[PDB]
Amino acid sequence: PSLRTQPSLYSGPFPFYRRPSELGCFSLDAQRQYHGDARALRYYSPPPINGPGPDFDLRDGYPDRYQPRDEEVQERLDHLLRWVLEHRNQLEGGPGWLAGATVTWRGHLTKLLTTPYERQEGWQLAASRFQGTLYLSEVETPAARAQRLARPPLLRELMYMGYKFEQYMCADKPGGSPDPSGEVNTNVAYCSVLRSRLGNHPLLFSGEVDCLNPQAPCTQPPSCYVELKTSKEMHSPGQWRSFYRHKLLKWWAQSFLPGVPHVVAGFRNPEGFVCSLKTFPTMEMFENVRNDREGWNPSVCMNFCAAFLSFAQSTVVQDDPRLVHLFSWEPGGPVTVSVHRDAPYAFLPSWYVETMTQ
Ligand SMILES: NC(=O)C1=CN([C@@H]2O[C@H](COP(=O)(O)OP(=O)(O)OC[C@H]3O[C@@H](n4cnc5c(N)ncnc54)[C@H](O)[C@@H]3OP(=O)(O)O)[C@@H](O)[C@H]2O)C=CC1
Ligand SMILES: [Ca+2]
Q: Buried-most residue among 112, 211, 220, 310 (CB within 10 A)?
């Protein structure tokens, strides 16, 4: 049993994808504690239109005011399971909606979406069915774990710079003012919880959300949300073309899933300064590669993802939170499956399983 990943198998019409609704949200504070409210949400606050072009120093505060998340901690789905536990009765969609849903993080779905074009990084997804519901939780691959432990100084600082850019672009209160003098603490996160459906696969997933734009004409989430990105300044048309083809595909996939309609990008020069901003509407990103022989195709992304969901659903027949079907994929190969029980792959915690059982 395996699943091919070549884009030519998936090039048909765009599949059904339900307009996403936000079911709720949660926050993680500076100590990585869960709170079932929006306390971590920040508000889009771009530089005044009448003032100077941005000149954000993305290195300011590195590493002295940097409080990085401890990446050795395996959170898996735990934060999302807690939200689900705390909202299990008052869920949308009617009786047994959760039982026919697939539950995962937005970022796991993003990786599925980009799989047909991905040439470098493989993945592993653990799958457990429990009370009908299919749960998907990423497993760090061996190469990804070594690459992580040996992360160049450069990539460590780039990651800080992405977060620092958000600090320059966001305020703690609507219409408030940004505060770059503060600490960059990546334990802090605001997460949106959404309902969608791909083909006939109902979806419940959560994703980190950078800010809410109080100037957006539609105030209903997720339409009022904005995604913040940084990227190298580009000069030649070849450089923009490469950007469109590789980077935009990932930006698209990440923001398309939860219905986040705009990505705001800060382009940074080699000295670490953002000295321009560009807005990319999620629904127009594909326009940049529509008639490009080397471009990507949203239909391919979504049809492969729908096909992977059908594959997972039909492969994972046993209802058992301690059993795991591990889906493995490396560039140039098909998705394959192995089966495992209990430690280390089993990822549904007892505090979830026991409460859901009662
Ligand atoms: N393989 C894993 O263990 C994963 C854990 N997660 C966790 O689950 C929750 C949902 O995250 P997501 O599904 O929104 O994740 P993704 O879309 O992959 O990333 C969105 C943002 O989440 C942040 N983020 C996500 N993962 C990490 C990380 N490992 N270390 C530090 N920051 C992280 C980051 O701001 C990133 O923004 P950029 O795409 O601009 O880098 C978060 O609390 C996240 O920590 C997510 C994906 C994969
Ligand atoms: Ca971001």
A: 112
